[PDB]
Design a protein around this ligand. Structure first.
Ligand SMILES: Nc1ncnc2c1ncn2[C@@H]1O[C@H](COP(=O)(O)OP(=O)(O)OP(=O)(O)O)[C@@H](O)[C@H]1O
Ligand SMILES: Nc1ncnc2c1ncn2[C@@H]1O[C@H](COP(=O)(O)OP(=O)(O)O)[C@@H](O)[C@H]1O
Lengths: 438, 647
């Protein structure tokens, strides 16, 4: 349990009728944006979505990404959520219209249920039956058990160095085997052998457990393009033979859709459409808002929550047009735009109290007003970053709770950006030996 | 540290239960009067020929009448002029000429002159004044000569209608109402494992382990003889070790974890089991020691003063030579230095400096003035040295009022240096009792070429007072104390040492012997070196490798695992059936209905089974009458399903 910048966000805090209530689940105020994000969460769960775009306006300091983490904890662990910033789309190995499709294919989720039948235990004998099939007795501390092996899983046992009485761990379903060690009954056969002597497991020999587990479609794309991990031994050279990201063509994705729809029609897997949260979308340039306008029109595309804080700025990559939000109006008509208004002075105090009781820093009511004064007069990100140093100035001076004096000391030890700009301009007047170098 | 034995409770001690006599001589004649009242064919005398305790009685009762050891003893008194010979429990174990009917370590009778008198005592104390059938037990796969000799003693010495031999563990099986199982019976002489299939013993494949309660007693005697190493003032009989094993040993469930953390200090007081065995003159001695001490101090003080005076005289002599050398020619300085046996003026200054440092550290009126001035110089030197030490102490205290860390690092380095010096000395000391050491070779090479504890305590005291990270455990004294060694915990316990008192030296402590001695049944080849297999491994060899490979039986795991029960006398240990159940659970396949239990009256059901068997139709169809002994011979075997194989 360590505090982040969004630890106190638990959920959107809605009613049963989809109406936001003030000071609920960590948020303070911000009604209409939480109502709209609740509608977005219901749209994601409704499974009637093949590409929808949601833009979040509002300047810096307001709660844009807090809404996104509220959505991410409102969906749960089940439905996948991929947060990427705009600046991650640039690479030096692939084009930047292919990393977008890699994020779209990381967004869609594919849930498979398995019943793994694991076999822990000491090998009793290695008897080749036919001349082929090789029986193995797996002795536990509860009883041994015979086991008939396929002639291909035995060539995976045999590659491992399993001889007489090594404890092993056979997966029955997936056919995965690991040699855990040599059993301690055969420990002191010789006296300085070099193995890992482990005791016989004091449980069952046949443990049957079931596991629900997810796979993203991008992992299917990578596992079908290039051999990965298992038998890819020439990758230890590194220079040309490493697993470099390659240009996954449209034909490969068009076939993987066929195969996944085949395994959904058999009732094996389940499909769950995810969320792609692209943050600070002004860093996306015009060679990607062209490609999003195509890639959202697929019948498989996930919902895209874009976040952008800028005003009428210059679209990157094409310097001769200005547009709102850094988003071209060719693309801006698709988006559902949600506003994010600033904070009143009576709605900053509650954020101070919630952020204080998240970090455990308790403080008197004469200091909450001072932190709210710095929140009104300077910024919201700065006033919340004085609750943690002042507690360090509290338990050192023989106190437990934070008073006005510790914050009056921390405002001098920890200057903000505005007073540093004033010192940088006015106090740092002459550019000489002991001056700043503009 | 006084803590580990300050709040320690007073000990709860158990005395020695030696197998003594008991004040009873009954000539019980009330059994023959009841035996002659029953109809014929249903009266028989049953004798369990046990190696530890021969039992005997009539079949129509539940408890045996006589339960005696095979001990006998014969004497002749010349002060009385009479031959004595009594046997059984009437021997006191004051005289002992004891010889037993059974061979020590094996339940095969080979001491027939004792067995004859034991049977004589049995037939006397039952009441025989004149011819009943005899049902008698023997060992598994008995030797034919022993059966021939026993049958010869039964027919020829006493005169009997019929007798029949059987295996006592199988009688306890038949009394326990089993049909098919795996009888594991740990007796006094050997531990048998016998598979029984539909009330029939499969004696072609029964296996006896060569360990038993007598081996328990003898191995316990050997380990108490080797534990108390320097000589224990007490008679260590075998029988008292047997009674120690009977009430102070239990088979541990998980042995390799219980054993390795057994002799830890925390909680040894509850593991350990302990066994008993049956001012004016001080002021005058203190004054004499004070007076002898005063005289030695006075002599030492005189010698010290004399040495100081001699050094002062020598210093004056060399200073005089130094003064005479001031202003003399280089030739006269060499003559004065040669007269003083000195090589150079530098050697003279070194001798004067050394003598001054040593003194600084340390007619009648003329002599008295010279002695008084010498004492004043010595006192002035001592006072100057004391002043110097006091100043150094003050400066050290003043420095301490300042830095402490750098001070602690210096004290740690000084401690390490002194420890290394102690180790180098210990090494030199150990090497001095040795030769190959290069130390004697370097000495011989040199001859051939020619041909602190107080300081450590002082530093530790300083670290204990000022260093919070330095504990008493890190002191040299702590690294040298009983509470550290395990051998005191192994022989004596967590209490302090024996001060050679009356009721303290005569004590035997038991720690490991509780779980080491009854463990030999499962790991024989390692603890006691008997080159055979464990009980678990024998049971697994029979259940998993021989019985499925034997034709004529239906289910090898589905039938023999229904009832595995434990019979013999060497079985009433705490947690003995559970160990065998966990071993067989580790060996058998998963799902076998294993149910290990034990008999009801483990030391007495071997008699009751032959008591209930004695007067049935199968027993009537398995007797050997007298004319059958006269015709068929001696080694004739009625093949019964409990007795051994016919020959
Ligand atoms: N309460 C008890 N706890 C543990 N052991 C006991 C107890 N009582 C008796 N014994 C053990 O039982 C043993 C006696 O067994 P028993 O006399 O039944 O063997 P046995 O039938 O004479 O053997 P065999 O058939 O070979 O002659 C003794 O060694 C004694 O240590
Ligand atoms: N309704 C709210 N309740 C509590 N904290 C909030 C709320 N809205 C914003 N915050 C705070 O704002 C900060 C996040 O600002 P952020 O949304 O990251 O701005 P931007 O999206 O412009 O980078 C977090 O520290 C969070 O504590």
């Amino acid at each position: 349990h360590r505090t982040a910048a969004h630890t106190h966000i638990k959920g959107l805090g809605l009613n049963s009728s989809g109406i936001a209530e003030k000071q609920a689940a960590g948020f303070v105020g911000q009604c209409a944006a939480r109502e709209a994000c609740g509608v977005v969460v219901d749209l994601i769960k409704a499974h009637k979505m093949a590409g929808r775009g949601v833009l979040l306006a509002g300047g810096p300091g307001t709660g844009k990404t807090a809404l996104a983490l509220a959505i991410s904890q409102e969906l749960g662990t089940k439905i996948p959520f991929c947060p990427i910033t705009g600046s991650e789309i640039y690479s030096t190995e692939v084009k930047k219209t292919e990393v977008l499709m890699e994020n779209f294919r990381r967004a869609i989720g594919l849930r498979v249920r398995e019943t793994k039948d694991v076999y822990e235990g000491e090998v009793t004998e290695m008897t080749p039956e036919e001349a082929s099939t090789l029986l193995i007795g797996l002795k536990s501390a509860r009883g041994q058990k015979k086991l008939r092996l396929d002639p291909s899983i035995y060539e995976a046992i045999q590659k491992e160095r399993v001889q007489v009485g090594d404890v092993i761990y056979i997966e029955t379903n997936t056919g995965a085997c690991k040699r855990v060690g040599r059993s301690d009954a055969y420990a002191t056969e010789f006296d300085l052998e070099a193995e890992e002597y482990v005791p016989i497991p004091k449980g069952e020999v046949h443990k049957k457990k079931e596991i629900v587990q997810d796979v993203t479609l991008h992992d299917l794309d990578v596992a079908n393009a290039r051999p990965q991990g298992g038998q890819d031994i020439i990758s230890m050279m590194g220079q040309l033979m490493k697993p470099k990201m390659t240009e996954i063509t449209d034909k490969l994705r068009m076939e993987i859709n066929k195969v996944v729809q085949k395994y959904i029609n058999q009732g094996v897997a389940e499909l769950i459409p995810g969320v792609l949260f692209i943050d600070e979308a002004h860093m996306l340039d015009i060679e990607c808002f062209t490609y999003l306008n195509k890639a959202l029109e697929s019948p498989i595309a996930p919902i895209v929550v874009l976040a952008s804080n800028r005003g009428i700025a210059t679209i990157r990559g094409a310097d001769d047009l200005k547009a709102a939000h850094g988003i071209p109006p060719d693309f801006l008509q698709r988006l559902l735009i949600i506003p994010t208004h600033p904070y009143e002075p009576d709605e900053i105090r509650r954020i101070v109290r919630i952020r204080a009781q998240t970090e455990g820093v308790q403080l008197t009511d004469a200091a909450v007003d001072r932190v709210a004064e710095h929140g009104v007069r300077i910024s919201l990100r700065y006033c919340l970053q004085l609750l943690a140093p002042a507690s360090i100035l509290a338990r050192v001076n023989g106190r437990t709770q934070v008073d006005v004096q510790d914050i009056a000391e921390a405002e001098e030890l920890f200057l903000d950006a505005r007073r540093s700009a004033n010192i940088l301009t006015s106090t740092g007047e002459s550019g000489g030996l002991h001056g700043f170098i503009s | 540290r006084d803590e580990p034995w300050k709040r320690l409770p007073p000990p709860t001690v158990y005395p020695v239960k030696e197998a003594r006599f008991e004040k009873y001589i009954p000539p019980q004649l009330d059994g023959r009067e009841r035996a002659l009242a029953q109809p014929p064919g249903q009266v028989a005398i049953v004798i369990d020929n046990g190696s530890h305790s021969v039992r005997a009685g009539w079949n129509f009762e539940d408890k045996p009448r006589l339960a005696i050891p095979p001990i006998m003893s014969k004497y002749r008194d010349r002060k009385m002029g009479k031959t004595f010979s009594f046997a059984g429990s009437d021997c006191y174990a004051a005289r002992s000429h004891i010889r037993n009917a059974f061979e020590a370590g094996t339940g095969i009778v080979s001491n027939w002159d004792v067995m004859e008198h034991v049977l004589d005592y049995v037939f006397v104390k039952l009441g025989m004044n004149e011819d009943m059938p005899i049902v008698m037990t023997e060992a598994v796969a008995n030797l034919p000569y022993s059966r021939k000799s026993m049958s010869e003693i039964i027919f020829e010495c006493y005169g009997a209608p019929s007798l029949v031999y059987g295996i006592d563990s199988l009688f306890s099986f038949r009394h326990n109402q089993g049909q098919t199982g795996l009888v594991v019976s740990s007796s006094y002489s050997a531990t048998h494992v016998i598979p029984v299939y539909n009330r029939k013993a499969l004696l072609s494949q029964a296996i006896r382990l060569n360990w038993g309660g007598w081996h328990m007693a003898e191995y316990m005697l050997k380990l108490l003889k080797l534990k108390y190493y320097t000589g224990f003032p007490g008679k260590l009989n075998s029988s008292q070790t047997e009674h120690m094993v009977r009430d102070f040993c239990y088979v541990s469930l998980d042995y390799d974890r219980e054993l390795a953390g057994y002799l830890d200090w925390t909680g040894l007081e509850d593991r350990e089991r302990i066994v008993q065995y049956p001012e004016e003159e001080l002021a005058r001695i203190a004054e004499r020691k004070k007076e002898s001490g005063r005289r030695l101090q006075e002599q030492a003080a005189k010698m010290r003063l004399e040495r100081l005076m001699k050094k002062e005289q020598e210093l004056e002599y060399y200073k005089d030579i130094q003064r005479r050398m001031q202003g003399e020619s280089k030739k006269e300085i060499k003559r004065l230095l040669d007269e003083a046996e000195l090589k150079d003026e530098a050697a003279l200054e070194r001798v004067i400096r050394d003598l001054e440092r040593s003194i600084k550290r340390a007619r009648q009126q003329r002599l008295l003035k010279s002695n008084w001035e010498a004492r004043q110089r010595a006192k002035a030197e001592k006072e100057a040295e004391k002043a110097r030490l006091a100043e150094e102490a003050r400066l050290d205290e003043e420095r301490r009022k300042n830095d402490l860390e750098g001070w602690l690092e210096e004290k740690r380095q000084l401690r390490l240096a002194k420890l290394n010096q102690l180790k180098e000395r210990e090494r030199l000391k150990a090497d001095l009792g040795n030769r190959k050491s290069l130390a004697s070779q370097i000495r011989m090479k040199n001859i051939a070429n020619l041909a602190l504890e107080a300081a450590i305590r002082s530093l530790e005291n300083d670290l204990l007072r000022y260093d919070k990270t330095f504990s008493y455990d890190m002191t040299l004294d702590a690294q040298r104390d009983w509470s550290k060694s395990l051998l005191h915990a192994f022989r004596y316990g967590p209490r302090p040492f024996d001060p050679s008192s009356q009721a303290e030296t005569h004590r035997v402590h038991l720690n490991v012997e509780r779980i080491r001695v009854p463990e030999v049944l499962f790991q024989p080849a390692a603890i006691a070196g008997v080159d055979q297999a464990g009980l678990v491994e024998i049971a697994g060899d029979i259940l998993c490798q021989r019985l499925p490979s034997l034709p004529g039986i239906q289910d090898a795991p589905d039938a023999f695992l229904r009832d595995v029960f434990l019979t013999g006398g060497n079985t009433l240990f705490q947690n003995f059936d559970e160990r065998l159940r966990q071993g067989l659970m580790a060996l058998l396949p998963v799902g076998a209905p294993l149910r290990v239990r034990r008999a009801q009256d483990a030391i007495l059901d071997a008699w009751r089974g032959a008591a209930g068997w004695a007067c049935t139709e199968e027993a009537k169809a398995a007797w050997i009458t007298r004319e059958e002994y006269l015709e068929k011979g001696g080694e004739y075997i009625k093949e019964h399903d409990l007795g051994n194989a016919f020959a």
